[PDB]
A paper describes a structure:
To better compare these data with crystallographic data, the crystal structures of wt and D76N were determined from diffraction data collected at room temperature (RT) rather than at 100 K. The RT structures are highly comparable in terms of conformation and B factors with structures from frozen crystals. For the wt, the residues showing the highest dispersion are located in the BC-loop, comprising Pro32, as well as residues located in the nearby N-terminus of the protein. A first mode, common to wt and to D76N variant, involves the residues in spatial proximity to Pro32. Our results show the presence of distinct minor conformers exchanging with a major form, on sub-millisecond timescales, within the crystal lattice of both wt and D76N. In keeping with these observations, ensembles resulting from RAM simulations showed that β2m displays two distinct conformational states in both mutant and wt. As sketched in Fig. 7, while globally wt β2m excited state resembles very closely the ground state, D76N populates a conformational ensemble, which is less structured.
Residue numbers in the entry: 0 to 99
The structure:
Amino acid sequence: MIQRTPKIQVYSRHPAENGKSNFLNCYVSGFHPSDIEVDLLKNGERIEKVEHSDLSFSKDWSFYLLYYTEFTPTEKDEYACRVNHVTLSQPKIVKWDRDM
């Protein structure tokens, strides 16, 4: 058996075909087992509709999850990714850097 802690990246992108749109992305990578809980938070509160969740694996040992949704951020609001996994003794909260 193997277990691997997820790596978590939080970042924003504008789709080229719709440059005014802005997406907040969670990239949760390299984890095992696949059982996982992932939320986007806005001001400590969970975001309800998250347009997309794309799950894949490399070889059998490793999963990859892209979690993302459109958003309109102000300089006041705060966004984060919360991840819970059996490898983590406490839920991992990764804040969005407004420069990324």
